[PDB]
Design a protein around this nucleic acid. Structure first.
Lengths: 121, 140
DNA sequence: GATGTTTCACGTGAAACATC
DNA sequence: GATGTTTCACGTGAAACATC
């Protein structure tokens, strides 16, 4: 089987009519099956390693936030900015309610976020 | 003939694999033949009227600059920023040599205006000197 | 070396002017 | 009303950090 097949498939992920989350799952599945690094994918598609990483990180977002991405109520920039936040769904609602830019959203994330319990001695 | 045909063709200009100049000529040709305004195209493709105008304005650039756009040595932002300049080809060379951002390119364009079309038209010099004209020689 | 994450420079597209 | 042009806000993608 010709090696060029893998390269063409990876190349055409970004050239196809895929939303950001469809591109993410594509890269993840291809990295796994063809056993390729974030760095290898990046060099293949002519992008940065962090771009590949940040794209796939979006798959970890709660389904409510992913729904906003698909519907276009949030952009990829908004979603990524709240990805490592305590309550991304709360922040998502604030972004849509307030009409926040990605820059304003980054500011919100900076200025926002538990006891494991056990019998008291 | 169904009217929806024109709309689909206009819609798919931006969805096709066209460089900025191919998109420009498409819009121009379609505006002409279907007798539609910049405003009508804009509303059809879900963009601004100025976006449609600025896109087509790029067709007026010298062939040398258009070549840089096609080759990717310049972006649409660079090309548009020098479109109303006296010598766009000179500016194009400076942008590529210096690796100037579009913001830096806009700054260059401000401080080298096309308003240098105040060139002397010539003409036989009159018998009576014309004092004011003679005095504007030094300052110019 | 591989990957997680944040901050900001960039070109693109639009607002804010202009003329005719 | 239609169109020419300039300036700048925006999201995207990358640099500059981090851990393991």
């Amino acid at each position: 089987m010709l090696a060029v097949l893998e390269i063409g498939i990876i190349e055409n992920v970004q050239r196809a009519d895929l939303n950001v989350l469809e591109e993410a799952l594509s890269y993840k599945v291809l990295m796994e099956k063809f056993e390729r690094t974030q760095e290898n994918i990046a060099q293949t598609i002519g992008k940065s390693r962090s771009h590949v990483a940040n794209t796939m990180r979006l798959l970890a977002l709660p389904d409510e936030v992913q729904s906003y991405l698909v519907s276009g109520e949030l952009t990829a920039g908004h979603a990524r900015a709240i990805a490592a936040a305590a309550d991304p769904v709360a922040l998502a609602k604030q972004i849509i309610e307030g009409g926040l830019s990605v820059r304003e959203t980054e500011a919100l994330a900076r200025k926002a976020p538990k006891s494991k319990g056990g019998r008291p001695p």
